[PDB]
């Protein structure tokens, strides 16, 4: 496919910078959802997926827990859509 | 493979930031080389390979009509 692929799930990048709600809207309109941090943490995909949006609504990082307490909703970040 | 794909070519990301010469050495160790500007300009691959080193010695970009820099380098 036209992007990354892992275990049968294919993620396409979107270069445009948009907030979380717009990213989710675009992913859903494209018959897809934002990447799940659970499946992307350990796998190599993180190297490409860092500082992109996730389902939980926070940028994806390698930290195990303790998500960013400070609000990140009003921010712009590139997004992947499955 | 572990990385991106185009025309039977696998591109692997080495997230470590390094100069052009260290990037060339690392790719040579892998038996691969840096991407060429021609193959990436006309592809979606560009969105991933932008601001990453190329064989020409300058960062890959669509613009324009240095050994002192370090940037994430792919390997094919």
């Amino acid at each position: 496919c036209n992007g990354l692929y892992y275990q049968g799930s294919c993620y396409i990048l979107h270069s445009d910078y948009k907030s979380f709600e717009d990213a989710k809207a675009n992913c859903a309109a494209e018959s897809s959802t934002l990447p799940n941090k659970s499946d992307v943490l350990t796998t190599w995909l993180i190297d490409y997926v860092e500082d992109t949006w996730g389902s939980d609504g926070n940028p994806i990082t390698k930290t195990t827990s303790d998500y960013q307490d400070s609000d990140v909703s009003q921010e712009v970040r590139k997004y992947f859509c499955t | 493979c572990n990385g991106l794909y185009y025309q039977g070519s696998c591109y692997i990301l080495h997230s470590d930031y390094k100069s052009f010469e260290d990037a060339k050495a690392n790719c040579a160790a892998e038996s691969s080389t840096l991407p060429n500007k021609s193959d990436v300009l006309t592809t979606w691959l560009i969105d991933y390979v932008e601001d990453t080193w190329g064989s020409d010695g300058n960062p890959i970009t669509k613009t324009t009509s240095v050994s002192q820099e370090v940037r994430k380098y792919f390997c094919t």
Partner: antibody
Amino acid sequence: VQLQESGPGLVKPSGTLSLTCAVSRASISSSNWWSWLRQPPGKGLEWIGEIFHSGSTNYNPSLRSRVTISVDKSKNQFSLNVSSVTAADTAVYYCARSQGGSGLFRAKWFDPWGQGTLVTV
Amino acid sequence: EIVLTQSPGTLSLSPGERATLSCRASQSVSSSYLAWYQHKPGQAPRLLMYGASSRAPGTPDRFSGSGSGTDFTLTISRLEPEDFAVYYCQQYGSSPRTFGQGTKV
């Protein structure tokens, strides 16, 4: 990439402080996120936002409301307006550059800084 | 907002020493992503290291950095009169990029 900061040193409280920086030896349209930072006198530094050639701006949540960063490509100048000053904003504002922005591989660290102008409210 | 604290506020020395500067984080920083800087009074701040263990071009080899998660540290093996100044920690693994307090020499 030589960055030089220029702006009004004195901005009375609650006014808008506009600091403009000039990009030299490179293009503002290039793949670089231009950020503005703050150094309160004697205290630690902060990060008061960033901008790109497309106008996309990402701010610090604490300072999101007050600040507005803009870009003018004709004069290759990326400027920052801080409104509703509370007299706690006195600092040596710095221009900054963060490699990347066109691709997915943005390097956050601000390698080329610029001599910062000190503004006294 | 990860708050970074630099333990030694001032490490006063005369030229020649294995100076060690340390700085800790409230929360773990992803990938040990901490790039130190330099600040000579008035002069434009520089990028001494990125990634907490890599030296950007233009800085000598005497700067060696090590750390992970909470704790990060910079080390100057030997000191020269043109290499003593304020130093900073910069973590870029959190949504708001947070600096650290200066460590004057």
